[PDB]
Amino acid sequence: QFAKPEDAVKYRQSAATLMASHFGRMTPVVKGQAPYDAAQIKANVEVLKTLSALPWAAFGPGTEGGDARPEIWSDAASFKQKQQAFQDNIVKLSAAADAGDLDKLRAAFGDVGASCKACHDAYRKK
Amino acid sequence: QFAKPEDAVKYRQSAATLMASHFGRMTPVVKGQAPYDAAQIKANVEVLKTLSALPWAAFGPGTEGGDARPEIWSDAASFKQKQQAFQDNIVKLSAAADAGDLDKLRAAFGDVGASCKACHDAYRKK
Ligand code: HEC
Ligand code: HEC
C-alpha cells in the first residue's frame, strides 16, 4: 500500500507511536497508581490488539529505512518469530483483560513489555 | 493518557497517518484498477473502523497544537457532530464491506472521503 519506502517507514513509526500509547497508558493501572476498571482495560487491550498486528506488513520488501536494521530483511524468519511471539504475548494480555483478572493482567503486561524490548534490542537502530 | 500536549498532537497525527493509509489504499479497488477481494476489504475496513475512533480522544482539554484549529475546542459540540458523522459514514462503509457489495462500497467510500475533507476544511490549519 506504499507508494515509496518512506511511506512504509512513516506508517510503521505511526503504528509504533499508537502501540506505545495504548500499552504505556496502562502502566499506572498495573502499578495500582490508577484504578482498575475491567471494562475500560478490556476495551483498551482490544485497541492494542488491533494495532499490534499492523507494523509487520510495513517492513515489506524495499521498505528499508528509518531506525529499522537490515537484519530485519536478511533474517526474515527470525524477525517473523519475534513479531509472532510478541502477538502471542498480546493474546495472553487480551485473555487477562477479557477475564477481568488483574493479577493476570500485571503478569501479561510485563511479558509484552519484555517482548517489545527484545525486538528493539536486536532490530532497532540506536 | 498524554503527559504533555505534544504527546496528544503526536498521537492524533499518527492515528490520522494510519487512517489515511487504510482508507487510501482502497482507492485502486474502488476505481477497479486493482481486484476486489471481499474478504481482504472486509478485514481492511475492520482495521479502519478501529482506527477512525481514535483521533477524537486526543483533542482533550489542554491538547491544543499541531495543525488543529482552536475552533475545535471553542465549538466542542460542532466538532463532535463532525467526528460522529464521519464515524457514521465509517459504519456505512463497514456494512458495505461486510456485505461484499462493491457498488455499495464505492458509494460509501466517497461519502467517507467527503467527510474527511469537510472536517479538514473547517478544523485543520492550512
Ligand atoms: C519487532 C518484532 C518489534 C516489536 C515486537 C516491537 N517493536 Fe517497536 N519498533 C521496531 C522497529 C524495527 C522499529 C523501528 C521502525 C523504523 O523504521 O524506524 C520500532 C520502533 C518503535 C518506536 C519508535 C517509533 C518512532 O517514533 O519512530 C516505538 C515508540 C516503538 N517501536 C514501540 C513499541 C512498543 C510499545 C512495543 C510493544 C508493545 C513494540 N514497539 C514492539 C520493532 C518492534
Ligand atoms: C474532524 C472530525 C476530522 C475528520 C473526520 C478527519 N480528520 Fe484528519 N485531521 C483533523 C485534524 C483537526 C487534523 C490536524 C491534527 C493536528 O493536530 O495536526 C487532521 C490531520 C490529518 C492528517 C495529517 C496528519 C499529520 O501527518 O500530521 C491526515 C493525513 C488526515 N488528517 C487524514 C484523514 C483521513 C484520511 C480522514 C478520513 C478517513 C480524516 N483525516 C478525517 C480532523 C479530521
Cα separation, A74 vs A77, in Å, equals 9
Which of A6, A111, A124 has the most ligand 1 atoms within 8 A of CB, as the residue to mutate?
A124
Positive or negative torsion for Cα B37, B42, B47, B51: positive
Please tell me if residue B94 touches chain A, with a CB cutoff of 8 Å.
Answer: no
Ligand nearest to the CA of B124: 2
Name the one residue in this structure whose C-alpha cell is 494495532: A51
Collapsing DSSP to helix, strand or coil, B70 comes out as coil
User: Any known ligand binding at A67?
Assistant: yes
How many Cα neighbours within 13 Å face the side chain of B26? 28
Query: From 3.40.50.150, 3.40.50.300, 3.30.70.20, 1.20.120.10, which CATH number describes the A2-126 domain?
Result: 1.20.120.10
Name the one residue in this structure whose C-alpha cell is 482506527: B51
Contact yes or no for B54 and A18 at CB 8 A = yes
Q: How many CB atoms lie within 10 A of CB A75?
A: 15
Q: How many CB atoms lie within 10 A of CB A20?
A: 16
Resolution of this model in Å is 1.0
Cα angle A32, A36, A38; round to 5: 150
Q: How many CB atoms lie within 10 A of CB B103?
A: 8
The amino acid that residue B60 corresponds to is G
Residue numbers in A near B51 (CB within 8 A): 50
Cα separation, A7 vs A1, in Å, equals 9
Q: Please state the domain extents for chain A.
A: 2-126
Q: Give a three-class secondary structure readout of chain B.
A: CCCCHHHHHHHHHHHHHHHHHHHHCCHHHHCCCCCCCHHHHHHHHHHHHHHHCCHHHHHCCCCCECCECCHHHHCHHHHHHHHHHHHHHHHHHHHHHHHCCHHHHHHHHHHHHHHHHHHHHHHECC
Cell triple for A73: 530483511
User: What are all long-range contacts of B68-75, with beta carbons under 8 Å and residues at least 24 apart?
Assistant: B68/B9, B68/B12, B68/B123, B68/B124, B68/B125, B69/B122, B69/B123, B69/B124, B69/B125, B71/B122, B71/B123, B72/B123
For residue A68, list its beta bridge partners: A65, A124
Nearest to B1 by CA among A29, A36, A93: A29
Positive or negative torsion for Cα B38, B41, B45, B47: positive
Collapsing DSSP to helix, strand or coil, B18 comes out as helix
Determination approach: X-ray
User: Any known ligand binding at B119?
Assistant: yes
Which residues 43-82 in chain B show a CB within 8 A of chain A? 47, 50-51, 54
For residue A49, list its beta bridge partners: none
